[PDB]
């Protein structure tokens, strides 16, 4: 999915 | 809270917000990937992102950032402050319309 890089 | 999308799945998170939202519109439903927990998926530049939250069972965070007591409260914050949530690569992503 359009997924945020969570870091 | 109407912007809480229970039993919803990330494609028709991106189906409400594609034809029922604006950019900046944005929906909480629950993890896919993490059973249990919950993932926001905002609009912006006409396409869907997803950002996953963190419960550690003593607060709620976007996995760094403010930490909060209840979802509700994290939304809040991001709502009224529409400048922090930047995604890595410094790009802010608004909080701004509820989806419903």
Same mark, same amino acid.
């Given at each position: 999915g359009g997924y945020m890089d969570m870091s | 809270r109407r912007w809480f999308h229970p039993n919803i799945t990330g494609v028709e998170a991106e189906n409400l917000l594609? #034809?029922?939202?604006?950019?900046?519109?944005? @929906?909480?439903?629950p993890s896919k990937?993490?059973?249990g927990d919950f993932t926001?998926?905002?609009?912006?530049n006409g396409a869907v992102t997803h950002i996953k939250? %963190?419960? #550690?069972?003593? /607060? /709620?965070? @976007? /996995?760094?950032?403010?930490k909060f007591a209840t979802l509700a409260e994290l939304v809040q914050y991001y709502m009224e402050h529409?400048? %922090?949530?930047?995604?890595?690569?410094g790009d802010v992503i608004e909080l701004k319309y509820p989806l419903n």
């Open positions: - | 594609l #034809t029922r939202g604006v950019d900046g519109s944005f @929906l909480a439903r990937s993490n059973p926001l998926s905002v609009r912006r939250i %963190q419960n #550690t069972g003593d /607060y /709620y965070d @976007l /996995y760094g950032g403010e529409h400048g %922090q949530l930047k995604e890595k690569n």
